[PDB]
Amino acid sequence: KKNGYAVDSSGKVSECLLNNYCNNICTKVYYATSGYCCLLSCYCFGLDDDKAVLKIKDATKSYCDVQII
Numbered sequence: 001k002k003n004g005y006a007v008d009s010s011g012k013v014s015e016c017l018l019n020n021y022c023n024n025i026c027t028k029v030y031y032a033t034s035g036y037c038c039l040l041s042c043y044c045f046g047l048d049d050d051k052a053v054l055k056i057k058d059a060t061k062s063y064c065d066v067q068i069i
Contacts, residue, residue: 003069004053006030006044011052014042038064045069 006014006026014029016022019036022044026032031048039060045068047053056064 001031001033001046001048002050002053003043003045004047004050005038005041005056006032006035006047007041007052007054009051011054013054014044016042034068036064036067 008014008029014022014025016037022036022042023032023034026035026042026044026047030044030051031046032044033046035042035044041054043064
């Protein structure tokens with residue numbers, strides 16, 4: 001279980017019309033505990049499987065940490 005940018009099967013992000021949805025999908029498919037619209041992608045926190053999660057920039061990580069962690 002890690003944290004990462006959740007892309008479904010080929011780098012297409014897990015959408016995110018709204019944070020709760022990102023989170024839900026990510027628990028459902030990746031086995032996150034949560035996730036949301038980080039700066040320009042679905043973050044997830046807990047992705048157990050890792051499809052090919054994207055490479056977060058420090059500033060984006062940092063920005064998108066304190067939020068939940």
